Amino acid sequence: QLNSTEISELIKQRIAQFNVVSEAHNEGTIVSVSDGVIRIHGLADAMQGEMISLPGNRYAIALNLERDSVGAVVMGPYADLAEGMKVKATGRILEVPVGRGLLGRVVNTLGAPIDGKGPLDHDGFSAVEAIAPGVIERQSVDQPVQTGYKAVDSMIPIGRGQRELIIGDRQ
Amino acid sequence: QLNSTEISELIKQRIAQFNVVSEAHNEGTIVSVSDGVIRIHGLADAMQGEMISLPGNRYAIALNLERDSVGAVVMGPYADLAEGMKVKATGRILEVPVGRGLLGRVVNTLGAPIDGKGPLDHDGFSAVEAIAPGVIERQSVDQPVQTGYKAVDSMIPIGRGQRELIIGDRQTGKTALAIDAIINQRDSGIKAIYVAIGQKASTISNVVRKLEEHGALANTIVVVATASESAALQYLAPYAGAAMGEYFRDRGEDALIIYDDLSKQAVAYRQISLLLRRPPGREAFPGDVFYLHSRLLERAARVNAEYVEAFTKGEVKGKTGSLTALPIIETQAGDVSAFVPTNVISITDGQIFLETNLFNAGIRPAVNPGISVSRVGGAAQTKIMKKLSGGIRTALAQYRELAAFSQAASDLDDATRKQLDHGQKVTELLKQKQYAPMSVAQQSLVLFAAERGYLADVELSKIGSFEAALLAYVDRDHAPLMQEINQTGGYNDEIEGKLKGILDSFKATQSW
Amino acid sequence: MATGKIVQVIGAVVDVEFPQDAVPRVYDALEVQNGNERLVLEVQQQLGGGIVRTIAMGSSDGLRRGLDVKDLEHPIEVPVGKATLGRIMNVLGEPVDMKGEIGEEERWAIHRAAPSYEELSNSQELLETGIKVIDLMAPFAKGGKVGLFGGAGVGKTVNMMELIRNIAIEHSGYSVFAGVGERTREGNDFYHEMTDSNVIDKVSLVYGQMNEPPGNRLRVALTGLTMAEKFRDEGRDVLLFVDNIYRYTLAGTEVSALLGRMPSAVGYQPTLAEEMGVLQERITSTKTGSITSVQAVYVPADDLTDPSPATTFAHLDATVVLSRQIASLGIYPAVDPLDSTSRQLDPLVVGQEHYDTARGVQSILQRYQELKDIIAILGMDELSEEDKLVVARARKIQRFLSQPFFVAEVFTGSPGKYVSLKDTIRGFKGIMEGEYDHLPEQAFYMVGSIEEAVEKAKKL
Amino acid sequence: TGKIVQVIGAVVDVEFPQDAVPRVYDALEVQNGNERLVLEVQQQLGGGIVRTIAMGSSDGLRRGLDVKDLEHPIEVPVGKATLGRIMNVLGEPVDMKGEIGEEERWAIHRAAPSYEELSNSQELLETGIKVIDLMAPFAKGGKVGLFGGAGVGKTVNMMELIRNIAIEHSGYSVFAGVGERTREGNDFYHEMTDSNVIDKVSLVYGQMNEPPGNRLRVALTGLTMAEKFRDEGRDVLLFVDNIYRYTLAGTEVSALLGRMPSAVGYQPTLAEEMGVLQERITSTKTGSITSVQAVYVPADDLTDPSPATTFAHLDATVVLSRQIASLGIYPAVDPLDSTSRQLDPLVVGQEHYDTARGVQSILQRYQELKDIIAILGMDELSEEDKLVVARARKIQRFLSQPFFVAEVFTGSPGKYVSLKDTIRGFKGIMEGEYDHLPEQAFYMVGSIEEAVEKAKKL
Amino acid sequence: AQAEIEAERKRAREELRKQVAILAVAGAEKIIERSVDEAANSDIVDKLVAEL
Amino acid sequence: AQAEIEAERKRAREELRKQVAILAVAGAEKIIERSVDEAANSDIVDKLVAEL
Amino acid sequence: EFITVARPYAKAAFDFAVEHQSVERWQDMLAFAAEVTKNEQMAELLSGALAPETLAESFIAVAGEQLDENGQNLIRVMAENGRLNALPDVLEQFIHLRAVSEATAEVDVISAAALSEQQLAKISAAMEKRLSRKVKLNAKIDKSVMAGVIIRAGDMVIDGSVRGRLERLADVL
Ligand SMILES: Nc1ncnc2c1ncn2[C@@H]1O[C@H](COP(=O)(O)OP(=O)(O)OP(=O)(O)O)[C@@H](O)[C@H]1O
Ligand SMILES: Nc1ncnc2c1ncn2[C@@H]1O[C@H](COP(=O)(O)OP(=O)(O)OP(=O)(O)O)[C@@H](O)[C@H]1O
Numbered sequence A: 001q002l003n004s005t006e007i008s009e010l011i012k013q014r015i016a017q018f019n020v021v022s023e024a025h026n027e028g029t030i031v032s033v034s035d036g037v038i039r040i041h042g043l044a045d046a047m048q049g050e051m052i053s054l055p056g057n058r059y060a061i062a063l064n065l066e067r068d069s070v071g072a073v074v075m076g077p078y079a080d081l082a083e084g085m086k087v088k089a090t091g092r093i094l095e096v097p098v099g100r101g102l103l104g105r106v107v108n109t110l111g112a113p114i115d116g117k118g119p120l121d122h123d124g125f126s127a128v129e130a131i132a133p134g135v136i137e138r139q140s141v142d143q144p145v146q147t148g149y150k151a152v153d154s155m156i157p158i159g160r161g162q163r164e165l166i167i168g169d170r171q
Numbered sequence B: 001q002l003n004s005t006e007i008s009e010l011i012k013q014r015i016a017q018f019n020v021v022s023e024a025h026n027e028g029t030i031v032s033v034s035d036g037v038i039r040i041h042g043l044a045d046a047m048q049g050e051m052i053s054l055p056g057n058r059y060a061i062a063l064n065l066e067r068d069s070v071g072a073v074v075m076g077p078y079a080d081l082a083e084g085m086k087v088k089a090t091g092r093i094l095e096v097p098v099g100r101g102l103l104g105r106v107v108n109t110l111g112a113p114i115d116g117k118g119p120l121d122h123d124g125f126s127a128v129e130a131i132a133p134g135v136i137e138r139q140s141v142d143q144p145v146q147t148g149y150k151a152v153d154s155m156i157p158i159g160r161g162q163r164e165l166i167i168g169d170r171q172t173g174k175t176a177l178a179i180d181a182i183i184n185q186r187d188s189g190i191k192a193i194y195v196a197i198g199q200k201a202s203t204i205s206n207v208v209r210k211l212e213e214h215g216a217l218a219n220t221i222v223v224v225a226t227a228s229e230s231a232a233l234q235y236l237a238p239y240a241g242a243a244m245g246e247y248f249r250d251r252g253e254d255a256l257i258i259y260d261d262l263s264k265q266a267v268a269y270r271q272i273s274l275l276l277r278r279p280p281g282r283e284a285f286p287g288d289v290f291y292l293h294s295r296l297l298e299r300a301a302r303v304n305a306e307y308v309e310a311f312t313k314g315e316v317k318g319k320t321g322s323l324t325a326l327p328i329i330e331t332q333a334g335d336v337s338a339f340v341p342t343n344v345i346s347i348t349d350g351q352i353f354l355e356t357n358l359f360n361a362g363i364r365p366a367v368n369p370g371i372s373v374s375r376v377g378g379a380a381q382t383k384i385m386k387k388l389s390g391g392i393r394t395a396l397a398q399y400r401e402l403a404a405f406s407q408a409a410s411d412l413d414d415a416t417r418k419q420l421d422h423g424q425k426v427t428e429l430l431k432q433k434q435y436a437p438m439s440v441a442q443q444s445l446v447l448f449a450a451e452r453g454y455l456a457d458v459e460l461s462k463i464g465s466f467e468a469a470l471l472a473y474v475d476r477d478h479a480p481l482m483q484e485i486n487q488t489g490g491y492n493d494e495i496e497g498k499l500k501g502i503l504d505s506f507k508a509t510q511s512w
Numbered sequence C: 001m002a003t004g005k006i007v008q009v010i011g012a013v014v015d016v017e018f019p020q021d022a023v024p025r026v027y028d029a030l031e032v033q034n035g036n037e038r039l040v041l042e043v044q045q046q047l048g049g050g051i052v053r054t055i056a057m058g059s060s061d062g063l064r065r066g067l068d069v070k071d072l073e074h075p076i077e078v079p080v081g082k083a084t085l086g087r088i089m090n091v092l093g094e095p096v097d098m099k100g101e102i103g104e105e106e107r108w109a110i111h112r113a114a115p116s117y118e119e120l121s122n123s124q125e126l127l128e129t130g131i132k133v134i135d136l137m138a139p140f141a142k143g144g145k146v147g148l149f150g151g152a153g154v155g156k157t158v159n160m161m162e163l164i165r166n167i168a169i170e171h172s173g174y175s176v177f178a179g180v181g182e183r184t185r186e187g188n189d190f191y192h193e194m195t196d197s198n199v200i201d202k203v204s205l206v207y208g209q210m211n212e213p214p215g216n217r218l219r220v221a222l223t224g225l226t227m228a229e230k231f232r233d234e235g236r237d238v239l240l241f242v243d244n245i246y247r248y249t250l251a252g253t254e255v256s257a258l259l260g261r262m263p264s265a266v267g268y269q270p271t272l273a274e275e276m277g278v279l280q281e282r283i284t285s286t287k288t289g290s291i292t293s294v295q296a297v298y299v300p301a302d303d304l305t306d307p308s309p310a311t312t313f314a315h316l317d318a319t320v321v322l323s324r325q326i327a328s329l330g331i332y333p334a335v336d337p338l339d340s341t342s343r344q345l346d347p348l349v350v351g352q353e354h355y356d357t358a359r360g361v362q363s364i365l366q367r368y369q370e371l372k373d374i375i376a377i378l379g380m381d382e383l384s385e386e387d388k389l390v391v392a393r394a395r396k397i398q399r400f401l402s403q404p405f406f407v408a409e410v411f412t413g414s415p416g417k418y419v420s421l422k423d424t425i426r427g428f429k430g431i432m433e434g435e436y437d438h439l440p441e442q443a444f445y446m447v448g449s450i451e452e453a454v455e456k457a458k459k460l
Numbered sequence D: 001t002g003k004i005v006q007v008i009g010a011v012v013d014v015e016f017p018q019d020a021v022p023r024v025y026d027a028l029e030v031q032n033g034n035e036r037l038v039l040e041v042q043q044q045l046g047g048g049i050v051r052t053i054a055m056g057s058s059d060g061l062r063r064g065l066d067v068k069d070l071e072h073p074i075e076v077p078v079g080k081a082t083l084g085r086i087m088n089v090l091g092e093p094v095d096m097k098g099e100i101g102e103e104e105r106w107a108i109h110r111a112a113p114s115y116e117e118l119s120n121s122q123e124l125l126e127t128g129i130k131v132i133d134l135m136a137p138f139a140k141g142g143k144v145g146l147f148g149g150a151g152v153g154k155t156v157n158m159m160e161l162i163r164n165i166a167i168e169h170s171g172y173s174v175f176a177g178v179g180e181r182t183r184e185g186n187d188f189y190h191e192m193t194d195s196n197v198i199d200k201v202s203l204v205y206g207q208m209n210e211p212p213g214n215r216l217r218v219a220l221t222g223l224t225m226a227e228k229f230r231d232e233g234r235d236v237l238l239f240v241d242n243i244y245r246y247t248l249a250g251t252e253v254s255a256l257l258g259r260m261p262s263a264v265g266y267q268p269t270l271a272e273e274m275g276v277l278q279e280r281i282t283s284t285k286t287g288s289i290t291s292v293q294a295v296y297v298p299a300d301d302l303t304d305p306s307p308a309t310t311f312a313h314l315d316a317t318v319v320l321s322r323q324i325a326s327l328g329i330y331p332a333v334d335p336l337d338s339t340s341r342q343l344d345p346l347v348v349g350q351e352h353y354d355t356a357r358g359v360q361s362i363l364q365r366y367q368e369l370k371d372i373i374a375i376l377g378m379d380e381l382s383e384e385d386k387l388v389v390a391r392a393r394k395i396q397r398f399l400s401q402p403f404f405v406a407e408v409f410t411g412s413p414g415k416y417v418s419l420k421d422t423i424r425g426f427k428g429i430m431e432g433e434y435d436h437l438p439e440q441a442f443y444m445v446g447s448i449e450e451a452v453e454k455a456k457k458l
Numbered sequence E, F: 001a002q003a004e005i006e007a008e009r010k011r012a013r014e015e016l017r018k019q020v021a022i023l024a025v026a027g028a029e030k031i032i033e034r035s036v037d038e039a040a041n042s043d044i045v046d047k048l049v050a051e052l
Numbered sequence G: 001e002f003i004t005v006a007r008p009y010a011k012a013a014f015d016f017a018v019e020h021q022s023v024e025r026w027q028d029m030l031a032f033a034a035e036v037t038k039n040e041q042m043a044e045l046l047s048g049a050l051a052p053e054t055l056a057e058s059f060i061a062v063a064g065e066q067l068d069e070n071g072q073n074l075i076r077v078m079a080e081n082g083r084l085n086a087l088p089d090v091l092e093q094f095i096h097l098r099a100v101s102e103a104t105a106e107v108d109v110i111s112a113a114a115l116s117e118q119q120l121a122k123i124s125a126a127m128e129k130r131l132s133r134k135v136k137l138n139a140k141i142d143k144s145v146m147a148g149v150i151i152r153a154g155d156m157v158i159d160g161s162v163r164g165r166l167e168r169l170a171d172v173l
């Protein structure tokens, strides 16, 4: 026997009017904050895997779509957030800066420069989650990837397009 | 003289003490019952850790204050209860009687007497749950706790306020060593407490009977929780025992406390916690199992005279009190690397490790050097003991390792031969009978004879005879030196010369 | 009038709804009519809403939701006293033999409180079994627990029958046998072997057969225990045999799992040590009488560290080990003198003569084992005169550990013998110290007292 | 303005009006009889409910007590005024001296320094202990971790490091007592005051008798002070008495917060709790923190997730072992598992690297011979395998060393061994130039001189 | 020594028989503000006296 | 031996004391039940409501 | 047992009733809802696994003489969450909330003797000193007290019975 985020003022709102107005399906409110996970009430149009914009310039990823709740994980310092904050769903899946100008840079996982050498000179944006090329779009691997270590390059060859596990204990 | 009139007068006095006017109380109802756990509805004014009175004379402890119920555990047989019985709230947080009038009594973990002696006399109550004195209030340990045995006073000395874990397998002499420690404090002015958690009942009665048989019982408090009784009583037994020991500590006196099996208490917390569905960890104990033994044992301490003065409102000046703890852990197959043994080794000031292979070989008490340690250091020991003992511990460890390799191959180089002879004679010298304590003068003579080389020309089969004769010789003629060494444990060149003369003359003049 | 109603039936677990003011207490017993048979339910938990959760002492098949449940205001009650000797009963104290209704002078509740402290005997007496190996090498404390570490096929049952016989004749005690988790085949022929040996009139039998539900098996132990408590209260010294304590542990585990409590240790119930303590602390010596117990022990995976052995060994006083190898020698009983032990062997409780004699025979037998390895690899030529003396006395000692039972007359044809402790001490004292070196080892075998050994020798 | 509504162990739930609910990690305050109690906010639940950890005794709390909302985190005294004094988790003085005359207070919850702000150094910081320096050299401004089970010497080793490092260090230092014995701290404090070095050390104590919230947040407080002395541009020495207790306090609290268990009953957020603390105890371009952390390992299990994730956060890791302590060999460092990021030919020179690798190779071969030695004994070894065994045993014994803080146990005088002496000794032993001495000559001697001298004494 | 207690056991219980009546009456009026005239209470305390 | 006998003295004293205590409250019970079927109840309840 | 899940609905319904002041009418509406839940044919339906919409509208058709806009919409919310059996408890907690808001309390008076009107009068006055709320006294007659009066203001109890005084004395000795 347990509650499910049915709480007093929300219930009173539904008592006043059960078929509550369409309003915007685009937006909702945070109802809980803990350990970098937030629960949001509303967001009728939030898609699974979509970015949710938060106060300041921060985002969350909608991972659980449940019966009148969205579970989302915060992509940064969460402890500043609070219950009752408004949030708006974007139309966007997570995308990252991409291009030749990233060579020689150190970036975080959102692609923001972290080395302090100034802004990027990327070549547009690419989706973080994407599907791999199909069976008919592959080609066999035959060119080498030269590691430079005698044991590896002799006994354990690595070719262009191979996936080679490096596995062992600490240190 | 048994006298009827004085009993009648006492009953009349109780009638006079009773007050007929009633008092308002907050009340609640039992809602559910299982395995000694209770769920109660009501008690809006309850506090966590409170004592709730049930029908009859039984009580319960409030563990969880849920939104619309209280989770609680019965301190006794819970089977007689039923949903709907009214429960009243005594605002008293869990408490138990304390005072020096408890010495010589056998008592339940709720403070009720279990012996047939009668009602109990106490100097108020002390709280079972409390936080030990802080870092500034503590004082360094600087005085000995002379138990009867040769080995642990020479190799693993214990100071007043120290915590030292007696650890070994079942039927290895743990209980005997602890109660012989109690019995030797019979005359040393240190009060003693023995807490039996989960032992078979017949054992406990036999232990009390042996304590009485040696006259130590008048100096002990005994707290009992049998293997038959509810797990909550066992779980709270060591905390009640701790609450009594603190009384002497805070008045500037010295006390000694034995916990008979902390492993059984840990099992009890397993049962209560798992019945409350708390997620288990390693070996199925909760992570709270460290905190359990931590806060229990950390009460044992030595406190500075400023704390004693501040506590007693200045009625005691300049004295320093202490509580010395000897916890006991039973470990499977001698494995010192299991979870709970490792936790308690991480809390005490050392441990005394008893090895079943030594015990089966007749080497008793079966103390294992190298594993046994006293982290407090030699500061606990007296001067003569500290000088005469010295490196005996590491010499014994090295002798045992050398015997290990010497069994494998023949390589004897005359210093190995004499090292082996010396180690074998020292091990034969360290063994000792049960209930046979010996004073520091006797111990110092024994150590002196061992390390000044006098046991040369003495057979291994003669070593016990040599000691019996030597202690009788020194009891007969040079007794005043024994009185002197027992009064002040002072090692001088004068006393060394007297000991040298005694051993020279004994070795040359006497027989064994 | 019945006042509760069944709400759920899920396996052996049955839930019942009573009126809010009448909720039956824990371990109270309840009865329902399951078809044209009554079925007894034992209350385990008082849930909210007036619903109690129970376990069926029998097959829970055929129960409907909404049956009427009748509230007996007491736990399960069983008959006790002399009228139960020679009878066979189930968990409920009902006769499972066909000899008909029991006398039933008194009926007692299986769930009882334990003896309290001021009731315990202020002494530490010994029990004289009359069997040479046991009284010498592993003496029983009166009111102690003894563990029988042997597999079937080496004489467990004949040892048990010999103890029953000797405690009935040479003392004035009765015995209770509790067959926890016993195959029906064994129960049948243990019953036959006791009736054809005249010990049946001096023992009471309660069998929990394995085909019974877990609730039955668990409470079978308690039934035998309460019958032993009745014989104790009459002032006797009583023997209680438990056919396997491991089965009691496992029945507790199964019931705890069915009720859904969180597991502990190596998957055992959280209440393991408590349940063992509840059983074992009732078996003690009181100021009126005593219950001594002999309990068969099975060690899982041959692992003495497992929680069931580790918990059981906390309570045992003596330990009897039976050996296939000793049995192959023709030596009966097949007790192993070097692995069997008792924590009563100290001078402080047993005296210096008995202690030094037991230690002596142990030393001789151990040295004999080492010398027998030397003989195996290098023959008898290596032995000195001292070694040959040790070997000879060891062989005489080993022969002298055999004994003819009043129960074994069927095979040997020799009359059975009960040997007093003093006679055993004197015999091994003499053999150890070189007396009786002048008469052969076969004079000691299966004879009895040492006087009987020398009188056997005179025409052997 | 708020009311207590549930009380579960050390965790307390409080209800606030919808417009007034506290932020995460704000500090609340309650009257518990005649005491004052501080609660730290962990989670915001639905409907103005907020869930907190009691920074003090939970006993005596009713439901319905009024809670006051202090609108800031736990903030502690900081700077030169905190020096030579002992403090609570809440920044309160616990010594009987008066008020701390602090000019500034900092919140214990802070963001870690940026990747752009970090700094690196190769400077070897010599420590007297022979084994640590040769096998695992530790540089100034880095992290050192002492791993060991219960009672294997990870506190005593740190006291020797405190003695030896304080010889060549001039600046301030901070000591965080986290969930350990009160007696160790009391003894430490009086050693510091009787040697007049206390004027340079700041102490925070959260020892093992205190309730879970205190032991959880005491570590963060100590980091706050160490970060002040770093940010003044100084260099700082930070000693942590036991970092394991910090993760275990989170374990003790975790299930009561309503979180599903992970792995061996641990909290699901274990890696982040460890990382968020570890990443701010670091050097920067304005100042540097040098730190030694004792790491308790439960049940001697070096594969347990807490020690396992601790390994990744350290530069030099010294692994102590019970098997070696049981042989008498102290300090009981295992040379085949202790390692450092600084053991490079470029950093320590080719001799320093070649000697260490020779020692490891010889010892590793000693291990592989132990099974045949166990079954068949030494006489069935090859004629140079016997020589390997002899040199490995000598090396094992020469790793042992008398400590100035172990005179209270051994009685032997202590020894300090400089780098230009220990590598000479081990190189000579490896090359066999000192092979003629007996094994016992190398036990508990400072330098090769003392070994040959001891061999003259047999 | 035990035998000596047996004589006193009976001797003393006889004294407590007669003291019990006094104690019972006193306790009853401690419970109740108004006193009792013992009109039908002699038989009551006599049964108490008989039982001890 | 002396200590053993002293313990017996204490045990006997308490045994007899327990009997008198329980019989005293039983006697107060019997006295009260017969003697309270009056307006004495009004005396008690008036003082209660004055104290309430 | 629905004691813990009833609170949100009781509180929200009470606040809405207060805003529109028809608290007494709301209590009638909930009483009607609680009695339909006890019916033999309905208590079978409420346990079936029908989709909330169909089940709710059957209940709503049965629940005549309720307000479509507000009361029947409370029914809709409870149907969605599958909690219509909470109505007999939501009613009691709504009544409790009303008693709290109206600063009025109900208490029980128990004795072996039927109490005189003057005794009850003085009891009510004293209780209104102890309790800020006005008090409605309920008279219960039980021979258990044997004498005296048992005051029962819910969980707060003042015992004035001779038997209580006696069994309190028995444990002093
Ligand atoms: N000094 C001694 N010499 C000989 N035997 C001894 C000595 N001390 C103890 N014993 C023996 O050790 C045995 C067990 O003693 P004890 O009860 O203290 O062991 P334990 O390991 O604490 O047992 P348990 O785990 O059952 O509590 C007894 O037989 C006792 O006689
Ligand atoms: N160099 C040494 N020589 C001899 N003994 C030592 C040495 N270092 C440590 N020890 C031993 O280790 C014991 C405990 O030391 P220490 O407190 O450092 O251990 P630990 O593993 O950190 O323990 P814990 O976690 O319980 O505090 C000392 O009392 C001593 O017996």
Ligand SMILES: Nc1ncnc2c1ncn2[C@@H]1O[C@H](COP(=O)(O)OP(=O)(O)O)[C@@H](O)[C@H]1O
Pocket (backbone or CB within 6 Å): C151, C152, C153, C154, C155, C156, C157, C158, C332, C333, C405, C408, C411, C412
């Ligand atoms: N005292 C004895 N005399 C003769 N034979 C025996 C004796 N004890 C055991 N045996 C033999 O051992 C075998 C098994 O005996 P049994 O009583 O069935 O063992 P268990 O009771 O262990 O099943 C039988 O052949 C039996 O004759």
Ligand SMILES: [Mg+2]
Pocket (backbone or CB within 6 Å): B174, B175, B260
């Ligand atoms: Mg013991």
Ligand SMILES: [Mg+2]
Pocket (backbone or CB within 6 Å): D154, D155, D156, D184
């Ligand atoms: Mg330490």
